Every structure is written in C-alpha cells, then in structure tokens.
Design a protein around this ligand. Structure first.
Ligand SMILES: *Cc1c(COP(=O)(O)O)cnc(C)c1O
Ligand SMILES: *Cc1c(COP(=O)(O)O)cnc(C)c1O
Ligand SMILES: O=C(O)CCc1ccccc1
Ligand SMILES: O=C(O)CCc1ccccc1
Ligand SMILES: [Mg+2]
Lengths: 362, 361
C-alpha cells in the first residue's frame, strides 16, 4: 500500500500550443487543454511517478477491464479566474474525499488525496491561461481512474491508470428552466448499489432515458424510486424543493443520503448555507410525486431546482408524468431562493467575496 | 453507411505467430490469439470497413465515453473442436440477438447481425489452430463494443469501436464451489439493466466478489428484495434440483423478470429438462428461507450454476449470516448436473447431431 508523490512530478511540456477558444462559444466537454496528468499503478510495484505531458490518446490493451466490466470512476470540479485575476478552486478536498471512497468501492487502489490535489494544482498551473478570461466561464477538471488489467476474468485489477483532463467550459445560462421526463420504468440506483459514488457504471444505463426525454420535449430526466415514486435526482444533479410543508411551515427539502443519492458538493454547500441562514426549516427527507402534486393543488410549492457542478442551480418549470404536464411555479416565485443561492456561490467562486471554501492556486 | 459487411473485410496477417499454450494450464481470459477484429463507426460517416489484424493495443482518446460513463457492452461465446475435428459454434445467433438488443439499450449504433457473425467466423478460421485439441477446452470469443466519443457530456456517442478478441480456455475457475451471500449488495434491480451484458453491471459487483475471496468463497450468491430471493451465482444462472413444497421433484430457476441475465445455457437446460419430462420444471422465485427449510427436510438434491464459461458448476456451500450452509449436491452424484454436462458437451463437441451447432465457415 502507498501513493504517488507530487514532489516526483515529471513535466514534459508541449512545444506546439493550441489556440484558446472564444469563452462565449464554448460547448461543454468538447475542447481540451495542451496538457494532461498521468500516473500508472501495478500490484507488483505500486504507483509509478506522476507525469504531466501533452494531451495524447491512451494506449490500452483491448482486454482492459475498464472496457468490459466498467472498472472505472471519475470526478468533476472547476477552476475559476477571479475578478482580481487570481485562479481559485472551490471545495476541492470534498472531491478528493469522494474520489478516494469511490476507488475503494470499485476495488481500485487508494492514494494520498493531498498528493493528488497538489498534482492537479501544478497541472492547472501549467495550463493556467486556459482558465477563461470571463466571469461566467471556467476550467472543468476531470480526474478519471480506470482498471487496465489485460484479462477477461471478473476481478480486482492488478494494473490501473489515473489521469486528469482539462476543458474550458462556459455558462449553462444566458436562467433557462428545464422540463423533466418522469418515467418510473427506469431506475438510476438501488439500495445496495453504487449510486452514492461517482462510478462509471451508474451512467451508462441512463443515455437511453435521456434520449427518450428529448424525444418528448424535455431537457432532463427526473429519476423516480420505489413504489411511492420518490423523486431522487434530476439528470445528474441533486434535487431541492422549496415549499410550505404538510404542517404549514416554510421548508427547504432534499432527499436524504440513504444510498441511492449522490452526495454532491453543491448539495452540501447549499445545505450549509441554508442551515447557517437559519430562516426556514431544512430537511433531508423523502419526497414523492403525490406529496408534490398534493402541494401544487394547495399552492404550497414555491420553487424546485437541480444542483451540481456544471449548473450550480437549475430551475425546474415542468414535469411530464402519467401522460400529463405538471407545471412547477418556480419562475413565478422569483425564483428568489434559487437566485440567492446562485449569486452567493458564484460570488465565492470568482473571489467577489472571501470564504474558506476557495483555495488560490499553488 | 448503416452497416459494415464481411465482404469488405481487410485482412492484415501477423508477421510472427505466437506459440500456443498447454490446454491444461489455461487461466481463463489471460492468453489471447494472433488476430483481432475491429470496426470503427462515426455518426457522420457511419460504419468503416471491418479489419482482421494482429492483436494490438487500442489508441483511444482519454475523453472516450466508455471510460467515463461506461458506454460499453460485451458478449461471450465459444468455438469447439469436435471429436471429428470439425470446429463448431453453439447457438451463436442468440448471442448476436442479445448483443444487438443491448446496443440499442446502450445507445450504441446498430449493426447487421449476420455480417458480424460472418466476420467472427472469418476471424476464428484464420486463428483456427488456437481452438484447442482437447474435449475439455475451447476457444472463447469476446465481441466487445465501446463508445469512443471524445467529449465529456453524458450523451449518445457519435463515435464507437466494435472489436472481437479470442482466448483459449479450459475451466473458468467437477470442482464444487462455495458461495458468499451478503444481502447488503445488489447486482441489479427492477427497472435496471441486469438483463443485458452491459459493463456497468460488473463494475459494482467487484467489491462483493473480493469480499467473497476474503472469506474463501469462489463466488457471490446474489440476493434481492426483503425476502432474500436467490437470483444468480456470480455471473452464472442458478438452478436448484429438489423436492418442492408440494412434494414434487422439480428443477427450478428464477424467472426472466428483468433482474436476471437470459443465459443461453440456462435456456438449453430448460429445453432439455422439458424434453426429458422426468420431473417438474419451474421458472419461479426461490428464497434463502425456501432453501433452508428445504435442507432441514432433506429435500434438496443439487444446486448448480450455468453459463458459457462454466456450462455446469456444482455448489457445495453457502456462507450467510455468519453460518456455513452445506448443500448436498456432491453426495447426490451429482446425477442431474452430470447428465446435463454430458449432454451439452456431447452436442458442443459433435458426438451427436444438433440444430444448436453450426460448423465453421
Ligand atoms: C456528479 C453528480 C451530481 C452533482 O454533484 P456535484 O459534486 O455537486 O457536482 C449529482 N448527481 C449525480 C448522479 C452525479 O453523478
Ligand atoms: C453471462 C452471464 C450469465 C450466463 O451467460 P451465458 O449466456 O449462459 O454464458 C448469467 N448471469 C450473468 C450475470 C452473466 O453475466
Ligand atoms: O455537475 C453536474 O451538474 C452534474 C454531474 C456531471 C457533470 C458532467 C458530466 C457528468 C456528470
Ligand atoms: O459464462 C458465464 O458463466 C458468465 C459470463 C462471463 C464469463 C466470464 C467473464 C465475464 C462474464
Ligand atoms: Mg443483411
């Protein structure tokens, strides 16, 4: 057991540089930077030294287990160029904590979280001119970790690769509210499954549901669970509901961490904000379609929104379910809370206000 | 171009051929033959021509969606060298049907099933001396299909690679196995993708499979629901031979309700067992309680797995809730299991005629 170490970094700088794109025209996940990070591991010898080097294709044995049995996991986080022109990461240690836990769930080897973070910082620092010059764009950071065992046995891999990609991305907006496809025939995650980790195999199974959703005029899938049709998540975002609850109290509600919900960083931040403001009840609790339709009949719903790293906050206007369109009155209610959370988090990400949630580049 | 064709195959033979392994030293899945099949697809241009070429690494964009969101799926079938020295496939059209259906569910591009089986046969023929000269060994064929979309959004890929590897194998692991049963982990769920061979179903199973080895088990027995239904034996279908609750002799296996892989072996064994008509045959739910109550009454004769890699794998023991639960499979012959193994191998190795085999092209 052990870890690679950032002090052993080997840097092979590119000698031909790609042109930076316009920050207003960026499509998500499609343009990549000049460099990547790579680190090899074998059970025989452990972790090899980390490399930063020019972006390149991966050379993989076709029997690699990432390709047959989904022995894989990823993370997502961002670097933000401040109004003061300092580049900041936001809650990055939470992503490392999650990554490590995911590795263990997947049977990939463990590593030292602080050491990975430092390696990420030096990567971003080398490609730092790729962090956009714009207050509603950013650099998305994709750490990825795959089994490369050359063998078709289903088992723990004895070889693996950890790598990191960088991709400048732009605003999810200029506030666009979404319609949701709620079809109970599909289930993202089950008790005793891996839905509370960022493991590749949770996502394969959902491209078909996203396609069905667009064919019916919807932008995202609302994931339902169990016999009472609990509402769990929105696409790949956590779900919040701002309403007057069944006892007539103003409440922010979100599903609890009971194994079928991914514990988002955004989710966490929001809950901490809500707790600290102390202005309404905050509840991690079960929410069903009927709870929801009953609330709508009695004018109790203020706002519904997704949260996650790509969107930050994503207002919901409509849910399609049992052959009908159910309107959600989010945009008619400001959306006051959603806009508050958005301006608070973006103020922090871009250094418009001080916070312990940000780290300035190393 | 909506589908590739076998007649466009481009064959690049290898310069130096590797030495074949010993048929009685084979570790499943570890030795590969001289050549592979590869077919590139893109949204814009459709399917490129298929190529048979030397086994090589794949060169993949690190953004490739197979690596991030498990946009991927596979199959598993076998070629068998006959006692008559004719090489045969076993119900391969069923694997093609299943691969196509799973592609549709993965949002991978569709392909002409016949043309793929033809390409596969041409790949086997070129590597035919790898089909081992032994009647307890075979050549494993591994069609595999991955998204190679170089962009990070979760979406239908606009680039894909279809490839086939071949691997000589003996057994997968009568060697009876012991099974680890921990209901804390679930393999697949209703409204999920457990009824197809998508790579995501296997990623999540690994932790449990390691936990099984830590306890001296060879496999995981997958349990489901609050009543602890017994679903599958690792990656094999599960069969139970017993006296049922109405006092009838019965072969039982879980029904195809979404959480169970519809194995080719499983379907053969049910056909055989209907054909013999010596005992009841039921696709029904079975629980750990059904099992332990039956054992207490000395009602259980045999329990075994069945899948391509291991056609019949008997089960002696299950570890559950801190106890070991002995299963008396090996002290009842195991007659049924042996009858089944002997018939399927008779067919697969050509000792009898059958509509389930196809002789190599
Ligand atoms: C990544 C992800 C989220 C959002 O998590 P953040 O850490 O806030 O970006 C939500 N749900 C699912 C299923 C996810 O994969
Ligand atoms: C492959 C597989 C089977 C049986 O497969 P065959 O087509 O009979 O080889 C059963 N269960 C699971 C989970 C599998 O992956
Ligand atoms: O970050 C989010 O809003 C959802 C998580 C996500 C983002 C990009 C690709 C896959 C998952
Ligand atoms: O054939 C089986 O019994 C299960 C299918 C399988 C075999 C080997 C590796 C992955 C899946
Ligand atoms: Mg045709």
């Amino acid at each position: 057991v052990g870890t690679f170490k950032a002090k052993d970094l080997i840097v092979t700088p590119a000698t031909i540089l790609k042109e930076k794109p316009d920050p207003n025209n960026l499509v998500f996940g499609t343009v990549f930077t000049d460099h990547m990070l790579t680190v090899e591991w074998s059970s025989e010898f452990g972790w090899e030294k980390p490399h930063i080097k020019p972006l390149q294709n991966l050379s993989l044995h076709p029997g690699s287990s990432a390709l047959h049995y989904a022995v894989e996991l990823f993370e997502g986080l961002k670097a933000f160029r401040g109004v003061d022109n300092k580049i900041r990461l936001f809650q990055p240690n939470l992503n490392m904590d999650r990554m490590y836990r995911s590795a263990v769930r997947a049977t990939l080897p463990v590593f030292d979280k602080e050491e990975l973070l430092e390696c990420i910082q030096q990567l971003v620092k080398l490609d730092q001119e790729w962090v956009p010059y714009s207050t509603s764009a950013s650099l998305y950071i994709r750490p990825t970790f795959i089994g490369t065992e050359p063998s078709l046995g289903v088992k723990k891999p004895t070889k693996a690769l950890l790598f990191v990609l960088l991709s400048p991305v732009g605003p999810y907006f200029s506030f666009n509210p979404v319609s949701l496809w709620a079809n109970p025939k599909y289930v993202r995650a089950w008790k005793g499954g891996t839905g509370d980790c960022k493991m590749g195999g949770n996502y394969g199974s959902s491209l078909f549901a996203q396609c069905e959703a667009v064919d019916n005029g919807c932008q995202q899938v609302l994931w339902l669970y169990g016999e009472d049709h609990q509402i769990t998540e929105v696409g790949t975002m956590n779900l919040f509901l701002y309403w007057i609850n069944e006892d007539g109290e103003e409440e922010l509600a979100t599903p609890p961490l009971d194994g079928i919900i991914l514990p988002g960083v955004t989710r966490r931040c929001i809950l901490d904000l809500a707790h600290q403001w102390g202005e309404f009840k905050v509840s991690e609790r079960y929410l069903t379609m009927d709870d929801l339709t009953t609330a709508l009949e009695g004018n109790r719903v203020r706002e519904m929104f997704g949260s996650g790293t790509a969107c930050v906050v994503c207002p919901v206007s409509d849910i399609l379910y049992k052959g009908e369109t159910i309107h959600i009155p989010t945009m008619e209610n400001g959306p006051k809370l959603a806009s508050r959370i958005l301006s608070k988090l973006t103020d922090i990400q871009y250094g418009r206000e001080e916070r312990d949630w940000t780290i300035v580049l190393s």
